Design a protein around this nucleic acid. Structure first.
Ligand SMILES: [Mg+2]
Ligand SMILES: [Mg+2]
Ligand SMILES: [Mg+2]
Ligand SMILES: [Mg+2]
Ligand SMILES: [Mg+2]
Ligand SMILES: [Mg+2]
Ligand SMILES: [Mg+2]
Ligand SMILES: [Mg+2]
Ligand SMILES: [Mg+2]
Ligand SMILES: [Mg+2]
Ligand SMILES: [Mg+2]
Ligand SMILES: [Mg+2]
Ligand SMILES: [Mg+2]
Ligand SMILES: [Mg+2]
Ligand SMILES: [Mg+2]
Ligand SMILES: [Mg+2]
Ligand SMILES: [Mg+2]
Ligand SMILES: [Mg+2]
Ligand SMILES: [Mg+2]
Ligand SMILES: [Mg+2]
Ligand SMILES: [Mg+2]
Ligand SMILES: [Mg+2]
Ligand SMILES: [Mg+2]
Ligand SMILES: [Mg+2]
Ligand SMILES: [Mg+2]
Ligand SMILES: [Mg+2]
Ligand SMILES: [Mg+2]
Ligand SMILES: [Mg+2]
Ligand SMILES: [Mg+2]
Ligand SMILES: [Mg+2]
Ligand SMILES: [Mg+2]
Ligand SMILES: [Mg+2]
Ligand SMILES: [Mg+2]
Ligand SMILES: [Mg+2]
Ligand SMILES: [Mg+2]
Ligand SMILES: [Mg+2]
Ligand SMILES: [Mg+2]
Ligand SMILES: [Mg+2]
Ligand SMILES: [Mg+2]
Ligand SMILES: [Mg+2]
Ligand SMILES: [Mg+2]
Ligand SMILES: [Mg+2]
Ligand SMILES: [Mg+2]
Ligand SMILES: [Mg+2]
Ligand SMILES: [Mg+2]
Ligand SMILES: [Mg+2]
Ligand SMILES: [Mg+2]
Lengths: 109, 134, 57, 113, 205
RNA sequence: AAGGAACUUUGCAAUCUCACCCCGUAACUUCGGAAGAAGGGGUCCCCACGCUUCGCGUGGGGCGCAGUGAAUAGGCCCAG
RNA sequence: AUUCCUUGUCGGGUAAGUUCCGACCUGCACGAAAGGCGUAACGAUCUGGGCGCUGUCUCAACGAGGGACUCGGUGAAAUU
RNA sequence: GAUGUCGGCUCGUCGCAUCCUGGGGCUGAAGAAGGUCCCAAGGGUUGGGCUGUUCGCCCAUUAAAGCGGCACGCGAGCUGGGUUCAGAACGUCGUGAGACAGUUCGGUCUCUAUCCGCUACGGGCGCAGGAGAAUUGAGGGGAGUUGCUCCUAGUACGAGAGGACCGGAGUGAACGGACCGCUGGUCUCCCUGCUGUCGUACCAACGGCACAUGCAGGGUAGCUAUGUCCGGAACGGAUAACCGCUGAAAGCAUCUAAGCGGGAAGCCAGCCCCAAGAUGAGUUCUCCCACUGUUUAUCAGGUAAGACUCCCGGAAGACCACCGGGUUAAGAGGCCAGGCGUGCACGCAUAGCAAUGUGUUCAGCGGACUGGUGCUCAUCAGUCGAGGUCUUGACCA
């Protein structure tokens, strides 16, 4: 409704690509180790989630991926944006033989 | 998002097996002891807000008993927590730690992880008892 | 329940209501070939002419 | 509101059974007389079906075999018409607005190849 | 004062330092001067400029005369900004610095004739407690014989949206200058491929 | 989604549950009963083996989120 | 199902119980085939509590189908 | 010849005898925290347990959990629990039929708005030519809530314990507005898996039907709240209670009797939205012009600028309206590429007695998304649409 010829998608990319990063070929069901970093007050710690990967979603800057682990008897999943600076290095560990693409059904485990 | 009827489980050895919510409040934890609310409302409780709660189940032997009331602080929203990078957490089961009026717990420790936001809002001690601070 | 009208309505209003029901007249044109009259963007019904012939005479 | 399609006051199972019989005849006889709407409904679905059939491989013929149920017609678009359509990128159909009618009083149309 | 025009291109996710800021992308392709109105001319203090371009053919005669009065080439769209001044013609560099709070105005996405819910946030009705045909209806309009009317402006079903909406104090995350692209913190009302005007904040703080 | 009777005059309504097989089953009792109490587990496809068959037990394999895979199909309990 | 005083007093359950259950006895105004007090089982009866499940609710959302709306055909009503 | 009643629910809006919040006087007011009274109605006023209940008691909070009016507001708005019909039982009255503002169980709340009123949206005409756009803001609506923490400060005060005003900085509830990038929902045929049965002759592959998706699994665009962004202000003018300056009547004293300053969450202005039907109809830029018709026809006609009509569509919308495109053309569809979605097609090969597995296959399939592309349709044309009344007045020839 301003009519103006323009590639919405490509200005989109123009921005949302400086803020974009690619990772290891994980397909879902692959187990993975993310080496996450935390800041505690001036100091920068370093935890590490390590789980079955259940969902990759979207793309470009907004591309994300959800891990799921059992940490101390209580079950917990967690979802990273491919390009969050509080996420340092992902590392495939296993390659799952997965028949679906979203892996929700494994929340009975 | 916890609200008044929510039966969360308990992370402590304070003898409360299972506690059910009953009000919410919105006190930080500053100065002398805990404080008194943002106000009336706040219709929901999520991770590190306090909730007043009644006690639904307990250990046949332990500090705190079957009916005992008493304020708890949340540790495991089955809901989801968005941290200012985009990271999201979520725990499969809903849970809390029981506490006293200066903050720290009637427990001797904590079972299962806790969300780094408890650290945000200065619950030192519970964060310390915590087996994992995700 | 069961709303009805309070008072019978007048010839006057009633025909002010009808004030619009007035039909709009097909705006027509003459159809370059067979020569009856066609509706704009449709087929001139006599011959069958949209630019050559389609539906038949 | 970026949605897209027609509900054509039928359900959803119907909607299909329609544009499948309608594609079935448009392919069965070069042009058809039918409501202007139901036509602008039958345009891009027949069209896409042209682009399935335009391909040769057995697949494309089972791909078509799903929507267009009668062998003769399938075979027609597969073997006969689609090939004929080779060098042309689209526009395998066109639409003509005739006029009115008595009962329903609805505008009407010819849709052709 | 401060102001310029451009399009709503899209909402996206980007990072400054460590946080997921959500940013909506505005464009503000150069706007040209067209009309400069002063008191001794038109009473009030303003400037009319223009956004999306248009080819001489699809253009009126009058509008042509207009756009020709200051050698400009037609813009599909005109608009005014009260109490401005510049010199030359108007882009976003020279107008915004990164971080400056700004008031962003658009039209909304409109919704058609909308329920008492959707429209005005009405309560509702006990979806299963015997409640004949009263599931979505606002209940009562008044009192009784007094006053015996219905109040002026009593909220009820109505065309929702397509309003002119302004949202206040928004922050210029990023200026992709001479690509006339603007990044702005958060929401901006009215649909993608939108027409929006970025003006300085109304306020101060 | 999170919660799970906070609804309300009352869980009104709607979901739960759902068939067949095998384990197992309370106070109370007029010894018939309660009782399908409760609560579990199995259920599909293939190959071999036995058995009274169309059939079925057993053993090993196979696949999908799930196998009365779709439809017909009890929510249960305590106490007046 | 009977209680005026009445939310009687006490206990149980609840975080909190005019309801409900037990006891109490000062039965306004129980009582023995106009049956009295019990009781297994039976109940689309009535009353309270629980477990389970749930848009009943917090707080509503998206979707679907049939209306409502538009066009051509036929065209009522109570009221006045 | 009918004004339907309690209570709930929905919806509201007024009063101020003010529950909170804001300002002040008094104090048996050191501070903190209070009592009480004057000003003050802008906004705000929680969730449950019992009872038909209003009410009231309790649970747990709160700045506060205000009091009342609007036919004890609100049934052509919903409930239908209380009471008021017929059935039945219990107590009590009555010899009886029957009885009781005693109790108890059950017990039909009636699809079409004519007018005023209201929310929205058009059609007409008006606004001294006929048009395309840009607008001043008369005046009118929304909005106005509040805690907690921290600094000032362990400072003033006070043996002490405790503990400020003022100012300044943050963080949050509820409400509102918008938004779909995130997190999720849904996504009625986008992709996949399933069964019983029918059919495409059979196998293999598919399609129906099992919803009005047969079931299950995911699910883009759009739409959404649980998600996100932003807000309530600052400042200024005039006030209330109140505090004072100069100061006479009444040589003194006096805020007042002439005059003057200060003074609130309130009024006006400031903020967001509508707004010249503001008939008092405003202003500005631009465009078309001074046409033709025996007044036997003192008003029409053909046209300019421009516009509709009609087709094609849209993040606009029930209709109308609104935005774009209409071949000088990228408007939509299709087509190509890509994205995203499903997750590894058919066939064939291979392994296996088979069920199946592996390969070929990051494979195949494809609703909305992003661009490119003249393959399709937006073809032809029909319909309107100016000639500018008078009066004075100033200015030019
Ligand atoms: Mg998702
Ligand atoms: Mg939140
Ligand atoms: Mg107990
Ligand atoms: Mg119809
Ligand atoms: Mg069907
Ligand atoms: Mg719309
Ligand atoms: Mg509702
Ligand atoms: Mg009146
Ligand atoms: Mg759930
Ligand atoms: Mg029921
Ligand atoms: Mg026995
Ligand atoms: Mg059983
Ligand atoms: Mg498996
Ligand atoms: Mg199994
Ligand atoms: Mg059933
Ligand atoms: Mg008691
Ligand atoms: Mg008897
Ligand atoms: Mg019987
Ligand atoms: Mg209860
Ligand atoms: Mg009709
Ligand atoms: Mg009457
Ligand atoms: Mg007063
Ligand atoms: Mg008020
Ligand atoms: Mg009265
Ligand atoms: Mg009343
Ligand atoms: Mg009434
Ligand atoms: Mg009743
Ligand atoms: Mg007697
Ligand atoms: Mg009407
Ligand atoms: Mg005004
Ligand atoms: Mg007026
Ligand atoms: Mg107002
Ligand atoms: Mg200090
Ligand atoms: Mg001290
Ligand atoms: Mg909100
Ligand atoms: Mg998106
Ligand atoms: Mg989504
Ligand atoms: Mg044969
Ligand atoms: Mg077969
Ligand atoms: Mg069939
Ligand atoms: Mg059949
Ligand atoms: Mg059927
Ligand atoms: Mg589905
Ligand atoms: Mg002043
Ligand atoms: Mg593609
Ligand atoms: Mg298809
Ligand atoms: Mg396209």
């Amino acid at each position: 409704q301003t009519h103006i010829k323009i590639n919405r998608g490509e200005l989109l990319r123009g921005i949302e690509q400086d803020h974009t990063r690619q990772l290891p070929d994980f397909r879902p069901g692959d187990t993975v180790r993310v080496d996450t970093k935390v800041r505690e007050g001036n100091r920068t710690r370093s935890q590490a989630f390590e789980g079955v990967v259940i969902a990759i979603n979207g793309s470009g800057s907004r591309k994300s991926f959800t891990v799921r682990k059992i940490s101390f008897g209580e079950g917990v999943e967690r979802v990273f944006p491919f390009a969050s600076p509080l996420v340092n290095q992902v590392t495939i560990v296993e390659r799952g033989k997965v028949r679906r693409a979203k892996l929700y059904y494994g929340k009975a485990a | 998002m916890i609200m008044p009827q929510s039966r969360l489980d308990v992370a402590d050895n304070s003898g409360a097996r299972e506690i059910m919510c009953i009000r919410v409040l919105n006190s930080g934890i500053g100065g002398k002891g805990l404080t008194t609310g943002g106000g009336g409302n706040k219709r929901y409780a999520h991770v590190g807000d306090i909730i007043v709660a009644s006690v639904k189940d307990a250990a046949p032997r332990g500090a705190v008993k079957a009916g005992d009331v008493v304020k708890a602080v949340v540790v495991r929203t089955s809901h989801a927590i968005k941290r200012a990078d985009g990271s999201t957490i979520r725990f499969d089961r809903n849970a809390a730690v029981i506490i006293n009026n200066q903050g720290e717990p009637r427990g001797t420790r904590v079972f299962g992880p806790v969300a780094r936001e408890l650290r945000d809002r200065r619950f030192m001690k519970i964060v310390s008892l915590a087996p994992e601070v995700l | 329940k069961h709303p009805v009208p309070k008072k019978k309505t007048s010839k006057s209003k009633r025909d002010m209501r009808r004030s619009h029901h007035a039909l709009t007249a097909p705006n027509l044109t003459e159809c370059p070939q067979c020569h009856g009259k066609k509706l704009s963007h449709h087929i001139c019904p006599n011959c069958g002419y949209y630019d050559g012939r389609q539906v038949l005479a | 509101h970026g949605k897209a399609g027609r509900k054509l006051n039928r359900n959803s199972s119907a909607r299909v059974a329609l544009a499948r019989a309608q594609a079935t005849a448009l392919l069965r006889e070069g042009r058809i007389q039918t409501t202007l709407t139901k036509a602008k409904e039958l345009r891009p679905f027949v069209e896409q079906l042209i682009t399935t059939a335009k391909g040769g491989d057995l697949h494309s013929r089972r791909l078509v075999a799903q929507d267009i149920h009668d062998k003769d017609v399938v075979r027609k678009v597969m073997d006969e018409v689609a090939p004929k359509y080779a060098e042309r990128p689209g526009g395998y159909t066109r639409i003509l607005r005739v006029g009115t009618r008595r009962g329903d009083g609805v505008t009407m149309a010819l849709i052709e190849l | 004062m401060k102001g310029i025009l451009g399009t709503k291109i899209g909402m996206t996710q980007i990072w400054k330092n460590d946080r997921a800021i959500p940013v909506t992308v505005v464009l503000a392709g150069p706007c040209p001067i067209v009309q400069r109105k002063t008191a001794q001319t038109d009473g009030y203090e303003a400037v009319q400029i223009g956004y999306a371009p248009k080819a001489e053919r699809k253009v009126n005669k009058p509008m042509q005369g207009h756009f020709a009065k200051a050698g400009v080439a037609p813009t599909r769209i005109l608009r005014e900004f009260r109490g401005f001044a510049p010199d030359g013609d108007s882009v976003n560099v020279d107008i915004f610095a990164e971080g400056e709070k700004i008031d962003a105005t658009g039209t909304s996405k409109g919704k058609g004739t909308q329920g008492v819910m959707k429209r005005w946030n009405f309560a509702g009705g006990p979806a299963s407690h015997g409640s004949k045909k009263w599931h979505r209806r606002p209940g009562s309009i008044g009192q009784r014989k007094t006053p015996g009317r219905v109040y002026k402006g009593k909220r009820m079903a109505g065309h929702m949206g397509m309003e002119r909406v302004t949202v206040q104090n928004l922050e210029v995350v990023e200026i992709r200058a001479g690509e006339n692209l603007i990044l702005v913190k958060g929401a901006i009302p009215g649909a993608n491929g939108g027409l929006v005007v970025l003006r300085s904040a109304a306020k101060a703080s």
